[PDB]
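Figure S7 source data.
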Amino acid sequence: ALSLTADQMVSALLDAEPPILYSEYDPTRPFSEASMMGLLTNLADRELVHMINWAKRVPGFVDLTLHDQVHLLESAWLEILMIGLVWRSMEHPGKLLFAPNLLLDRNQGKSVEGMVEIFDMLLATSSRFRMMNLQGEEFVCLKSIILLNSGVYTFLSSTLKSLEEKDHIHRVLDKITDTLIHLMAKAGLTLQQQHQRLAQLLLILSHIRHMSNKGMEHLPLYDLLLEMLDA
Amino acid sequence: ALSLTADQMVSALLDAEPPILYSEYDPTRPFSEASMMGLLTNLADRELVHMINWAKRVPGFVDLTLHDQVHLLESAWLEILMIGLVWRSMEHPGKLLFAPNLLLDRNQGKSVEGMVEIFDMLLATSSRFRMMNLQGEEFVCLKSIILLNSGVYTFLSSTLKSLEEKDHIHRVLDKITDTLIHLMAKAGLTLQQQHQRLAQLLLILSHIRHMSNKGMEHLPLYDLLLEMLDA
Ligand SMILES: Oc1ccc2c(c1)CCN(c1ccccc1)[C@@H]2c1ccc(OCCN2CCCCC2)cc1
Ligand SMILES: Oc1ccc2c(c1)CCN(c1ccccc1)[C@@H]2c1ccc(OCCN2CCCCC2)cc1
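Tokens for the predicted PTI complex:
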């Protein structure tokens, strides 16, 4: 876990990658009446299941407490669905690849009230990824950081156990930071460029947190998540 | 601007620091009827004015477009008020130093509906700052990063001007990253520790974004901000 090598962390995360699901939409039926929200909703609910399997495979995650594992996913679930959406949409300018059979552009967002706001923020993030030429290895590191970071400041506890957990989460996270830098070092970037790029990458996560928040508004999960985790 | 030296960036930001305002509350009147929200509201509205002066003094900020300057403050205003609150509350465990004459603890939050949620998140952030032993120089760098970063992904424009602006904002931001590292290098931290600490610092900003979002819910600003900026 905390002994994992940089290259081993990347092989470990890359291997943990979830599958790219398809939208359960009837291709022969008129789209102008498919219920946009309904499609996205059913899609996300199915990815959530695979998200758990993925999370269980992120180094150090299963070491935590079941209830801590739930808390973290409960805080990050939507941010992870989003950063994943933005990634696969990276090479699709002006469009969002929700699923191989569900590629929507701006206008298609004006379907539901206030959904075009969220699409634009997503497209913009996708665009930034294009601008930075984000790499698949950098991507998985970021998605793992989101998972371990998003809920680590809201355990609201100072018990010895919560203290060892928080400690352990920031130790894995540090490992991921080291890994990100390693990648950038190998790409040829100087020390300065490594720091600057690391910062540019982490700061985009603030934007993903914000999008998630807007998404939560437009949109118990704990028990649902629990049952999936506790196998 | 983009030529500023590390030590010059810190002297520049430290000098730009706003004043620590007081709550306009009658000390001889019973507090159980002072209207908690009213106090906080009037306080923030006054700090906002000083926030503009401060922003105008952040290197590279005034170089932007007035409308870009407004957009950035409109996106970050509450996050900045919050990171400032958390900072001055750092040495006050279990309490929030909203102002020298307004130090409130947990329970005092149960005043308004759902306000104790926000206080707890704030206390937790303050606690993390204590855990990391954040330094005044690191603090100002972070507050400047928030200002330039929070709204840089939502300009929703690809005009040449918007492209040069975004470019220019990420160039100042990189300067601040270099500065943060410089500080950590001088503190004695190794290269590895520098990277890890930079990451831990930036990631807390995601949490500040989240708190701001919750704060915006519980809670035009553009025109208001405009008038203050355009002097
Ligand atoms: O990979 C995916 C799949 C779907 C989505 C994204 C990524 C990001 C943007 N997004 C969204 C979020 C809010 C408003 C509009 C769109 C959709 C989305 C996300 C979540 C969602 O949830 C429906 C409720 N559902 C109930 C069971 C537990 C899981 C959540 C419904 C749609
Ligand atoms: O330095 C300060 C001063 C006040 C506050 C913070 C920091 C952070 C937490 N916080 C808050 C935010 C939402 C809910 C509860 C508390 C208060 C706060 C923040 C903003 C606020 O705004 C009232 C509306 N006001 C109208 C004019 C433009 C500026 C905004 C009222 C209270």
